[PDB]
Amino acid sequence: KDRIEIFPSRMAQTIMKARLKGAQTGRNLLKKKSDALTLRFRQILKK
Amino acid sequence: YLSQPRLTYKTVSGVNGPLVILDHVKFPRYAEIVHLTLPDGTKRSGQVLEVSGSKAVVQVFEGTSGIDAKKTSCEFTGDILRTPVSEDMLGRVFNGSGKPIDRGPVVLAEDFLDIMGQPINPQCRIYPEEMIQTGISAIDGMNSIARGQKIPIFSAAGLPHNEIAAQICRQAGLVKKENFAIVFAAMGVNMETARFFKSDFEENGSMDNVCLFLNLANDPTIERIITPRLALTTAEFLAYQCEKHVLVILTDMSSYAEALREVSAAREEVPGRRGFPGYMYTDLATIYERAGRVEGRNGSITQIPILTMPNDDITHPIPDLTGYITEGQIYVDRQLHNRQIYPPINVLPSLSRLMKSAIGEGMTRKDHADVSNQLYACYAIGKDVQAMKAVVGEEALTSDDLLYLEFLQKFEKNFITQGPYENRTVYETLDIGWQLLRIFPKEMLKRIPQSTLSEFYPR
Amino acid sequence: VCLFLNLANDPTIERIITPRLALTTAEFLAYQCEKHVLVILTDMSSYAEALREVSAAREEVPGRRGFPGYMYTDLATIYERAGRVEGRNGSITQIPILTMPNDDITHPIPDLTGYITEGQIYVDRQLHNRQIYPPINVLPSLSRLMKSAIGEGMTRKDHADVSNQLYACYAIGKDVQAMKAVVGEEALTSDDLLYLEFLQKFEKNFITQGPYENRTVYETLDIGWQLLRIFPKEMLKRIPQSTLSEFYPR
Amino acid sequence: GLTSEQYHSQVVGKIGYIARCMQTIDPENNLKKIREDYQDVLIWAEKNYRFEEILEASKSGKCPNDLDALSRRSLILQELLRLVSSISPFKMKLDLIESQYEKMKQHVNLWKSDYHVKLNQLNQLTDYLKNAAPTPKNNFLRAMTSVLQMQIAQYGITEDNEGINQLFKLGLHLLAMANEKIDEQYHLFKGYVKDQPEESPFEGILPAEDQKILVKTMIDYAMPKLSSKVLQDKLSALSSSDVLTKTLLDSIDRIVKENEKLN
Amino acid sequence: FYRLKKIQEKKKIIKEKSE
Amino acid sequence: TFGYVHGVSGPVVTACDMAGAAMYELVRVGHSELVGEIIRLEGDMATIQVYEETSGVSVGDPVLRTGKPLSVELGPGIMGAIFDGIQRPLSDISSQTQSIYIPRGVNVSALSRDIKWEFIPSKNLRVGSHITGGDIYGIVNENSLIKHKIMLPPRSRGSVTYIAPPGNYDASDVVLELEFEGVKEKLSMVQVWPVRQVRPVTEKLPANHPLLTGQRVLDALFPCVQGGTTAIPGAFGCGKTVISQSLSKYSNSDVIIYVGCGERGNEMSEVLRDFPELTMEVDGKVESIMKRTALVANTSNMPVAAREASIYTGITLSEYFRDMGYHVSMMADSTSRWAEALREISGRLAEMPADSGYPAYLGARLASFYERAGRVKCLGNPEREGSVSIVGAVSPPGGDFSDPVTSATLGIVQVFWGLDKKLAQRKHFPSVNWLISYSKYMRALDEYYDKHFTEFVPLRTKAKEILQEEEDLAEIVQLVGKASLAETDKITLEVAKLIKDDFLQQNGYTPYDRFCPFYKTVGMLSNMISFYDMARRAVETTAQSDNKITWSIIREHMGEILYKLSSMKFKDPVKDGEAKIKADYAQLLEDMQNAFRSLE
Amino acid sequence: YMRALDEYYDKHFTEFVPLRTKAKEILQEEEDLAEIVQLVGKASLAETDKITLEVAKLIKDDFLQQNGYTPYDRFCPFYKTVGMLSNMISFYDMARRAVETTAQSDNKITWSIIREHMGEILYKLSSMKFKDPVKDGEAKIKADYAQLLEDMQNAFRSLE
Known part of the structure; x- marks a missing residue:
């Protein structure tokens, strides 16, 4: 479903903005993890 | 000049909040100044907030408590608020309304100036050019300030933005490769911080250049309103008439905005975005834009507004309109503050739009722009690598990543971290920047031309 | 053809009466001259904004996002001037055109127009960017009077079944597209691949159309069947067997 | 588009403008064909009506009042008048005036027409020369533009005339050419004279004093580059010519190249 | 905002009625 | 004649004895004559929004009732002048007052009455000749670059009774007199026009002609048309200066009107410092563009009414110059800041806040503003065509195109050039992103290209396709690397690299290609797309053979041709003639043909 | 008020200012690390990161936690506070010294060896809170904390 179902408020806005930044941070961390794993995987393919 | 006797009225017709409504007034002026004597002999100042027919809505500076009809007298001074200005008020302390609080005498005016001032003519405003060194490396070497720039510090509540401001006020000056001045204006500053400013400047001897306005948190909010305008009227006098480069440091424009909200609501105006008046953009611009170099006058005015962003929301009207009106931003960072790095100036989101004019040959030094860009790039890569380090672990990093992490550590420890009383000329900040960039070999300094590397990299 | 023009530079408050002039003329033609009239009202958004300006000047109670509280009633006064009448051979077919602001169907203008009108033909940026014409998004499109405009007699008797099954297959194709972005192609089952193929060929053949091409309802339904034949009978769960066994094999 | 009163005022004004264009292009009533074509609009000025009378006529429809048709007719006459004026001294033949009027009237959309483009280019040249003071560039441009006129x-x-096309191209190129490029200006003008079919292109077109100044302009450029007094005296002797000729330019070339070969 | 605008309108009306 | 101040609160003033006052009429309140605008009426009262600071205004002060709404004063003297958003001449104020501030309530005439202008009447006009609105009754030799055509005001007409002989006059001199229905009107060289009233035209013609800029990315892939409506993201390092300077210096526009509309102080000072020093080549001589440019420049502390009226004053000056048959490029630097001034005025009036705080009429105002652009058959007798091309820049917060000003701007404009700081950092100058950018005038320009540059349209389509194909292949190359691509995709990648590096990218600071004539642009793209076609043919026709050709073989064999294509930039129209450039590009085509033919 | 109280601390509790600084540093480091520990996993952490996490948990559980209803912790004198934090921070310093000394060396020390070698030290550090000023004298509590410091130094020196 489209929305998180938290009720609008300035506190809700702060919470959701923090959660968005957290999700983006996790996305970047996991993406760098994926890049590292893929680099090692390609190296092992060559070897 | 006014050779005309003043009129004193007892015709108080109402008292509603901070407003004394008088009636039967002879030709009231809007924004006239008024001295009202309470029944007991106390005297309070005030300003004609509104006018209609013979009525006069005198907003009293102090509270209206103790005012009554039928006995309060109210002398209409016959003129708008004009501040006396001289060079002698360089090296003084004044409360928000211009009355000295340094146990010195009242200002013997070289001139009387209307605090509202007039907008600087765009065709006469000149591009700012040269640098004003602040002594703080995190801005002198990465976000330097041009003479005429308005570049606010954005900080949250509880970060050491007041301490940074006091340091800038103590240290700032021309790059010196006696016509400099600072007008400090604290709005809504609590007693402890006001006493801190007053004692700090006096002690560390910058006072001969500092004109200090303090509007304590318990001083009238209307006085808070007129504090930055006194500060900037004095700045205009010293810069565009006495021809000296003035740095205006307006502390807590968030507090100024709260005072503006109070006065707006007193006028009974319906709130705007997030409760602030709709015209806050124009008001903040009337304050900020009293800056910049002008045609044919050696003097200039540089501004460093300081903002307490509520809730740390950069979209909040105060910081948002300040970002629209000013020409950069210097972020103060909670993470650095907790890590105990001082000054906690996060250089990544901070930006100085006219740094390219502030720096360069004949202004700071030939290598300033390249060192700045390289330090920023290496810092960004260092943060990226520090994020990757927890994913892959130190033993899996390449040697370049280790060099970037060493640079990050030494950058936050030697370049950013300064200590409140360590004054660094821009040359010394650049030498530290080069000591940091010598962590890497030349080949990874990809944003510094070889022309500069060959000249500055060695040693 | 009769044209009423109120350009962007023309008065704002006059856009309130322009629809009413046009619909008064349409009603004269349809309910007194017995013409079959097609009424088009361009930028009901630029009408609703004129209505908002007038209501704000009057300081009337606002609805959502500033629009007046009676915008439903006013847009009803406009739209409801359509349809046939007893004993009079004329009709009035309206096709209002309104620009969803920020492409948001929940915005008061499109929302109230959806409540008032008997449908909405949805034009999709996500199709216009791919350069499909007409970029109609059938999935949020609707037509309340289809349920009797189609059937045996008028048009063909597979019309309703084909329409319903095309809707269902298109929705499942969108679901498959959504999930493949997460799991990737390597994790899709052959049924999901059938749905993706249906979606592709459906936007290519059924939706996509020449701006001067007039497909009869029979051609359109034959295309619908040519697309539904991508699936085995058992996955066309909407269509009854009495229709599948008659139209599917061909 | 236009309001009603302003539309009919425009009708009145454009009828007056067509009358003025006719009376300026043909102040002698020589263009019988064109005047017959424009008689329905010319009549309201041939008779001395007032502005209000013609406005009432336009409201009544008695006079021509279709503003688009009036715009087409007025544009035709305006382009013809520009063509007649931009050649100023060189009176055009009545037969040519009528034939080109017919062609312009025939053109589908004048504002896109090559006729209009050529007129704009001619006006560029004429406007620059109306102001700028004599120089090598200005003398060359005035000369070439007079020949073009x-x-x-x-x-x-209204024809693909090679001579006129070449003059347009080279004159506009010289006009666009930078003012400090003395050598390139001289090269362009010399190349024009060389490639021109005639031997004395400017005879009878420019006044004699201007021709003398032109040959003097050539002489002053040729002289400083020489290396022999005998050849300098020969250049002075050539300077006696009152007319510029392709063979004269050949002679100056011979002088300068013989100086070179002496070097 | 609309509530406060209505309230200010009504205060103005009351002030007028006071005369 | 005079009203009297009856009350004051902030900018709002209430004046009594204003029975005859007209709505939105301007007044000069106070003894200092602060300009104000009548926003409401009641009985004999008039409520005035005073633009300037009201401190010191007192009850009983005169309120002089100026008989006009906010109107621009049009006539000789505009060219090269710097105006505030309320038409105040900032340069004349500074010169006359010798003060670095705008005096409060200054009242300097917008067009100087002191300076004499050379005026030459329309030779045909006579006493009694019938004349109408928009007719040119004389020409003023304002500048070497601009002749200023003195026109009758629209809504004026009649029979001429006095037209002055050629000579020197001034804005206060009655130069013409006409008579209509016995009423006699005496006209000087200046006409005053309400800024918010669209100046009439006989017909607003379609915009079927390019608005050249000399920047290849702008002219070829995203063309604008004389009379167009365009948007530009405004950001720090994006480089809107490239577009503004190119339009000012090289565009085929006859006139330029630049509107700051609420800039930062030093950001406006930069424009005022640069524009006077810009120069252009006209008739082989270097002339300052201030002979053909007019600046409505004002900063953020200037009156809010000035910032909101800045766009209208600019567009009204542009319309005035359009009426003379000129093409006028009007560049509004921040329609976002104009919209913020509009929101501020709405909030001060206490109007209901619409979407995201902006007023109820932001969209309607933007529409009625951008609508004033367009190529027009001008009013009046001399058949003329003019145009106003609005290039209004907009500032989305952090690239967020969703805020009302940007959304309406991108729904109302017909071109979007989409500068990009990321490209600026990558050194891709101009910073046009060539993916988010677009131009809806491509269809309107088929009529023009098919006549003058017949081969350009398919060329442009293929170039856009190539760029989109590389945009697609960039994702694949991440997953599986470059070598995985087919030879066709390698051709796509490498030709797209060639185009981006040596066609779209452009070193504007250098003489050879600061201005790129469209014949040069079309020749460049023709050669590059011919290379694309030939490489595609060579690979496609030999993928089935034993001697299969590959991009590697193509690169090794035709390195010379690739270098020449990349160097095609260096042809200089000022040192190489148009014919020479065309011949050289044809030669490159022939040599490419020979190399491909010898390989195939 | 920390800037103003530094002069008081410099005279009465000299050592407290660096201990405060390092406690704040440690807590911020744990905050930064926990996001990766939860978003990704604990596998990649270094030994100094393990020390930071574990000593920061020690500070959070056994220093910044104070059940005010207990006989011993309804009020915590500042000598008790500064002694507790001094011991915990000295433990952090010596653990970091061990791992830094044995990095790039054969006998690489880790938190996994420190915890096992001196789990008694960790337990006593956790139990420092329980010392009761009311019945344990100021001198007795100071002696206990000095004894923990001595035991910590001995344990680290024996591990080293």
Whole structure:
């Protein structure tokens, strides 16, 4: 479903903005993890 | 000049909040100044907030408590608020309304100036050019300030933005490769911080250049309103008439905005975005834009507004309109503050739009722009690598990543971290920047031309 | 053809009466001259904004996002001037055109127009960017009077079944597209691949159309069947067997 | 588009403007064909009506009042008047005036027409020369533009005439050419004279004193580059010529190249 | 905002009625 | 004649004895004559929004009732002048007052009455000749670059009774007199026009002609048309200066009107410092563009009414110059800041806040503003065509195109050039992103290209396709690397690299290609797309053979041709003639043909 | 008020200012690390990161936690506070010294060896809170904390 179902408020806005930044941070961390794993995987393919 | 006797009225017709409504007034002026004597002999100042027919809505500076009809007298001074200005008020302390609080005498005016001032003519405003060194490396070497720039510090509540401001006020000056001045204006500053400013400047001897306005948190909010305008009227006098480069440091424009909200609501105006008046953009611009170099006058005015962003929301009207009106931003960072790095100036989101004019040959030094860009790039890569380090672990990093992490550590420890009383000329900040960039070999300094590397990299 | 023009530079408050002039003329033609009239009202958004300006000047109670509280009633006064009448051979077919602001169907203008009108033909940026014409998004499109405009007699008797099954297959194709972005192609089952193929060929053949091409309802339904034949009978769960066994094999 | 009163005021004004264009292009009533074509609009000015009378006529429809048709007719006459004026001294033949009027009237959309483009280019040249003071560039441009005006008066703009096209191209190129490029200005003008079919292109087109100044302009450029007093005296002797000729330019070339070969 | 605008309108009306 | 101040609160003033006052009429309140605008009426009262600071205004002060709404004063003297958003001449104020501030309530005439202008009447006009609105009754030799055509005001007409002989006059001199229905009107060289009233035209023609800029990315892939409506993201390092300077210096526009509309102080000072020093080549001589440019420049502390009226004053000056048959490029630097001034005025009036705080009429105002652009058959007798091309820049917060000003701007404009700081950092100058950018005038320009540059349209389509194909292949190359691509995709990648590096990218600071004539642009793209076609043919026709050709073989064999294509930039129209450039590009085509033919 | 109280601390509790600084540093480091520990996993952490996490948990559980209803912790004198934090921070310093000394060396020390070698030290550090000023004298509590410091130094020196 489209929305998180938290009720609008300035506190809700702060919470959701923090959660968005957290999700983006996790996305970047996991993406760098994926890049590292893929680099090692390609190296092992060559070897 | 006014050779005309003043009129004193007892015709108080109402008292509603901070407003004394008088009636039967002879030709009231809007924004006239008024001295009202309470029944007991106390005297309070005030300003004609509104006018209609013979009525006069005198907003009293102090509270209206103790005012009554039928006995309060109210002398209409016959003129708008004009501040006396001289060079002698360089090296003084004044409360928000211009009355000295340094146990010195009242200002013997070289001139009387209307605090509202007039907008600087765009065709006469000149591009700012040269640098004003602040002594703080995190801005002198990465976000330097041009003479005429308005570049606010954005900080949250509880970060050491007041301490940074006091340091800038103590240290700032021309790059010196006696016509400099600072007008400090604290709005809504609590007693402890006001006493801190007053004692700090006096002690560390910058006072001969500092004109200090303090509007304590318990001083009238209307006085808070007129504090930055006194500060900037004095700045205009010293810069565009006495021809000296003035740095205006307006502390807590968030507090100024709260005072503006109070006065707006007193006028009974319906709130705007997030409760602030709709015209806050124009008001903040009337304050900020009293800056910049002008045609044919050696003097200039540089501004460093300081903002307490509520809730740390950069979209909040105060910081948002300040970002629209000013020409950069210097972020103060909670993470650095907790890590105990001082000054906690996060250089990544901070930006100085006219740094390219502030720096360069004949202004700071030939290598300033390249060192700045390289330090920023290496810092960004260092943060990226520090994020990757927890994913892959130190033993899996390449040697370049280790060099970037060493640079990050030494950058936050030697370049950013300064200590409140360590004054660094821009040359010394650049030498530290080069000591940091010598962590890497030349080949990874990809944003510094070889022309500069060959000249500055060695040693 | 009769044209009423109120350009962007023309008065704002006059856009309130322009629809009413046009619909008064349409009603004269349809309910007194017995013409079959097609009424088009361009930028009901630029009408609703004129209505908002007038209501704000009057300081009337606002609805959502500033629009007046009676915008439903006013847009009803406009739209409801359509349809046939007893004993009079004329009709009035309206096709209002309104620009969803920020492409948001929940915005008061499109929302109230959806409540008032008997449908909405949805034009999709996500199709216009791919350069499909007409970029109609059938999935949020609707037509309340289809349920009797189609059937045996008028048009063909597979019309309703084909329409319903095309809707269902298109929705499942969108679901498959959504999930493949997460799991990737390597994790899709052959049924999901059938749905993706249906979606592709459906936007290519059924939706996509020449701006001067007039497909009869029979051609359109034959295309619908040519697309539904991508699936085995058992996955066309909407269509009854009495229709599948008659139209599917061909 | 226009309001009603302003529309009919425009009708009145454009009828007056067509009358003025006719009376300026043909102040002698020579163009019988064109005046017959424009008689329904010319009549309201041939008679001395007032502005209000013609406005009432336009409201009544008695006079021509279709503003688009009036715009087409007025544009035709305006382009013809520009063509007649931009050649100023060179009076154009009545037959050519009528033939080119017919062609312009025939053109689908004048504002996109090559006739209009050529007129704009001619006006560029004429406008620059109306102001700028004598120089090498200005003398060359005035000369070439005078020859171009004579060719326009002789042939008309409505044909792919190679001479007129070459003059347009080279004159506009010289106009666009930077003012400090003395050598390139001289090269362009010399190349024009060389490639021109005639041997004395400017005879009878420019006044004699201007021809003398032109040959003097050539002499002053040729002289400083020499290396022999005998050849300098020969250049002075050539300077006696009152007319510029392709063979004279050949002679100056011979002088300068013989100086070179002496070097 | 609309509530406060209505309230200010009504205060103005009351002030007028006071005369 | 005079009203009297009856009350004051902030900018709002209430004046009594204003029975005859007209709505939105301007007044000069106070003894200092602060300009104000009548926003409401009641009985004999008039409520005035005073633009300037009201401190010191007192009850009983005169309120002089100026008989006009906010109107621009049009006539000789505009060219080269710097105006505030309320038409105040900032340069004349500074010169006359010798003060670095705008005096409060200054009242300097917008067009100087002191300076004499050379005026030459329309030779045909006579006493009694019938004349109408928009007719040119004389020409003023304002500048070497601009002749200023003195026109009758629209809504004026009649029979001429006095037209002055050629000579020197001034804005206060009655130069013409006409008579209509016995009423006699005496006209000087200046006409005053309400800024918010669209100046009439006989017909607003379609915009079927390019608005050249000399920047290849702008002219070829995203063309604008004389009379167009365009948007530009405004950001720090994006480089809107490239577009503004190119339009000012090289565009085929006859006139330029630049509107700051609420800039930062030093950001406006930069424009005022640069524009006077810009120069252009006209008739082989270097002339300052201030002979053909007019600046409505004002900063953020200037009156809010000035910032909101800045766009209208600019567009009204542009319309005035359009009426003379000129093409006028009007560049509004921040329609976002104009919209913020509009929101501020709405909030001060206490109007209901619409979407995201902006007023109820932001969209309607933007529409009625951008609508004033367009190529027009001008009013009046001399058949003329003019145009106003609005290039209004907009500032989305952090690239967020969703805020009302940007959304309406991108729904109302017909071109979007989409500068990009990321490209600026990558050194891709101009910073046009060539993916988010677009131009809806491509269809309107088929009529023009098919006549003058017949081969350009398919060329442009293929170039856009190539760029989109590389945009697609960039994702694949991440997953599986470059070598995985087919030879066709390698051709796509490498030709797209060639185009981006040596066609779209452009070193504007250098003489050879600061201005790129469209014949040069079309020749460049023709050669590059011919290379694309030939490489595609060579690979496609030999993928089935034993001697299969590959991009590697193509690169090794035709390195010379690739270098020449990349160097095609260096042809200089000022040192190489148009014919020479065309011949050289044809030669490159022939040599490419020979090399491909010898390989195939 | 920390800037103003530094002069008081410099005279009465000299050592407290660096201990405060390092406690704040440690807590911020744990905050930064926990996001990766939860978003990704604990596998990649270094030994100094393990020390930071574990000593920061020690500070959070056994220093910044104070059940005010207990006989011993309804009020915590500042000598008790500064002694507790001094011991915990000295433990952090010596653990970091061990791992830094044995990095790039054969006998690489880790938190996994420190915890096992001196789990008694960790337990006593956790139990420092329980010392009761009311019945344990100021001198007795100071002696206990000095004894923990001595035991910590001995344990680290024996591990080293």
